[PDB]
């Protein structure tokens, strides 16, 4: 219970909880440490700043700087934190992202998800790949993560759309025949606020979906 | 340098453990990551509780041996005592702890070496 706990005691906890006792397999790189910093940030924002309202809401870059200047293991990177954090999100924006374009039985509507913050736009249920898991297992993991629907018995590994937006490789598997009565709900702590169907004709030929609209329409007209 | 990191590591660890449970005295051993489960009798199925975190085999100021998991998914930590080592079982890839009041908790340790070492410590500690 952090009901009243100083920001130093918080950073002490977050050190022992997410950083200092990690398995050695991912404590070797700097970026791998920063991914656990992002986990410790979500804990601080969602949980620690909910038992003690006096603690300030910090951005991920600001929170990382405070924790790097705090945890003794991370003192080496505290001076070059801005450059090391730049290398972190430079690393993160290159991880392959897999998802699924779930079409309905009429192939005229698809499933899109909206981010937590109201400013965030719509997009297909997709997420970054984990260590050693396959592209299909990743698409199943994140579609189930963001829509609560299991598409393992429906995903077709040979039917996908491969895209390389900026440095981020994105692969979305086309899964038609998803009934409109199927129930959707996200199984994350944030990240997803809404899940609805959208008419493909009502999409702009805001959304990060446009890149996939050219290949998807050609794929549907074939069937 | 390796021993220096272990000194700072155990210092911050112990201070955080005392922050949550001041009765804790020292840390006997640590497992990197442990997922906790609970076996539902009557339902005859295992329930996966979202208690995932670092595992701290600790000892309190009253010489009671227990373990603390700093849950990474919620502030709800897990502190459980081991009153007799015949309540922990090494079965398959998991440890099965039958708490004193007929509760069955299943600990999956990410590191198999941490599983065997923690299990052997408990079997020798009493």
């Amino acid at each position: 219970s952090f009901t009243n706990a100083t920001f130093s005691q918080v950073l002490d906890d977050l050190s022992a909880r997410f950083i200092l006792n990690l398995p050695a397999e991912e404590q070797s790189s700097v970026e791998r440490l920063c991914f656990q910093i992002e986990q410790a940030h979500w804990f601080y924002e969602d949980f620690i700043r909910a038992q003690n309202d006096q603690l300030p809401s910090l951005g991920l870059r600001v929170f990382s700087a405070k924790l790097f200047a705090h945890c003794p293991l991370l003192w080496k990177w505290s001076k070059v934190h801005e450059e090391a954090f730049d290398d972190f999100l430079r690393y993160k924006t290159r991880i392959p992202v897999r998802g699924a374009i779930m079409l309905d039985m009429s192939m005229q509507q698809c499933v899109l998800v909206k981010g937590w913050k109201a400013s965030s736009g719509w997009g297909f249920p997709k997420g970054k790949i984990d260590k050693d898991e396959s592209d299909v297992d990743c698409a199943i993991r994140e579609v189930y993560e963001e829509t609560g629907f299991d598409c393992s018995s429906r995903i077709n590994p040979n039917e996908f759309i491969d895209m390389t937006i900026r440095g981020q490789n994105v692969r979305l598997y086309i899964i038609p025949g998803i009934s409109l009565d199927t129930r959707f709900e996200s199984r994350t702590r944030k990240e997803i606020s809404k899940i609805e169907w959208h008419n493909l004709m009502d999409l702009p030929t805001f959304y990060m979906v446009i890149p996939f609209l050219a290949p998807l329409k050609k794929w549907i007209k074939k069937r | 340098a390796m021993e220096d990191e272990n000194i700072l590591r155990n210092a911050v660890n112990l201070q955080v453990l005392k922050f949550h449970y001041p009765e804790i005295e020292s840390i006997i051993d640590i497992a990197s990551h442990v997922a906790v489960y609970q076996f539902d009798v009557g339902s005859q199925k295992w329930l996966k509780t979202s208690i995932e975190g670092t595992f701290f085999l600790v000892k309190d100021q009253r010489a009671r041996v227990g373990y603390v998991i700093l849950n990474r998914n919620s502030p709800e930590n897990l502190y459980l005592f081991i009153n007799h080592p015949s309540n922990v079982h090494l079965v398959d890839r998991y440890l099965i702890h039958r708490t004193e009041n007929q509760h069955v908790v299943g600990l999956w340790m990410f590191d198999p070496n941490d599983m065997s070492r923690i299990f052997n410590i408990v079997k020798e500690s009493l």
Binding site: P23, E25, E26, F35, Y91, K92, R94, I95, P96, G127, K128, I129, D130, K131, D132, E133 | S32, H33, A35, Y37, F39, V41, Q44, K45, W46, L47, K48, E52, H89, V91, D92, R93, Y94, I96, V104, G106, W108, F110
Partner: peptide, 23 residues
């Protein structure tokens, strides 16, 4: 090549845990 989720995050499913006779 690059990943966002470690291995320990993929804890085995609840069905994987053993069911000894005494359970």
């Amino acid at each position: 090549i690059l990943y966002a989720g470690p291995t320990f995050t993929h804890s085995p499913a609840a069905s994987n845990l053993p069911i000894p006779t005494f359970l």
